Paper text:
Here, we focus on the deleterious toxin of the atypical tripartite toxin-antitoxin-chaperone (TAC) system of Mycobacterium tuberculosis, whose inhibition requires the concerted action of the antitoxin and its dedicated SecB-like chaperone. In addition, we show that HigBTAC functions as a bona fide RNase that specifically cleaves mRNA after the second nucleotide of A-site codons (mainly CCA codons) during translation. HigBTAC has a similar compact fold as other RelE homologs, with four antiparallel β-strands flanked by three α-helices.
In addition, alanine substitution of residue K95 of HigBTAC, which possibly corresponds to the active site residue R81 of E. coli RelE29, fully inhibited toxicity in vivo in M. smegmatis. Note that the K95A substitution that leads to the inactive toxin was used as non-toxic HigBTAC control for further in vivo and in vitro analysis. In parallel, the crystal structure of isolated monomeric HigBTAC[K95A] was obtained at a 1.9 Å resolution and used to compare possible conformational changes that may occur upon association with the ribosome. Notably, these regions include most of the proposed catalytic residues of HigBTAC (i.e., E66, R68, N73, K95, F93, Q98, and K99), suggesting that such differences could have some functional significance. In support of this, the structure of HigBTAC clearly differs from the alpha-fold models of HigB2 and HigB3 in particular in the two loops between β2-β3 and β4-α3, which contain most of the catalytic residues.
Residue numbers in the entry: 8 to 127
Write the structure that this text describes.
Amino acid sequence: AMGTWKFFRASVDGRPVFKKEFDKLPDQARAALIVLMQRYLVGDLAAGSIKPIRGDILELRWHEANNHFRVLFFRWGQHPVALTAFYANQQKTPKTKIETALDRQKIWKRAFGDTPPILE
């Protein structure tokens, strides 16, 4: 169901940074976000669920909970790579989160390559 999703870590060996962030969220929100991540791959999201943020960064938003839970990610070839997961109060995704996302994309691309290897 989660297909080609990846989860930000700083190195092939490093701390599972995205998962530690994700895991702190409430059960109901974690379950809802997994469903959105699965649907993202199928192509059947409603318009409230996916927003372009800046550059290559995209946002999954849990619409049924006033977009209070979100995942920033980017497409690394055919693999969406989850960069940060967070609770948010305002509709405007905060600057700090977007900077973290941009920073983690650069970190990822530097450690693992700008695009996936042709064979995994």
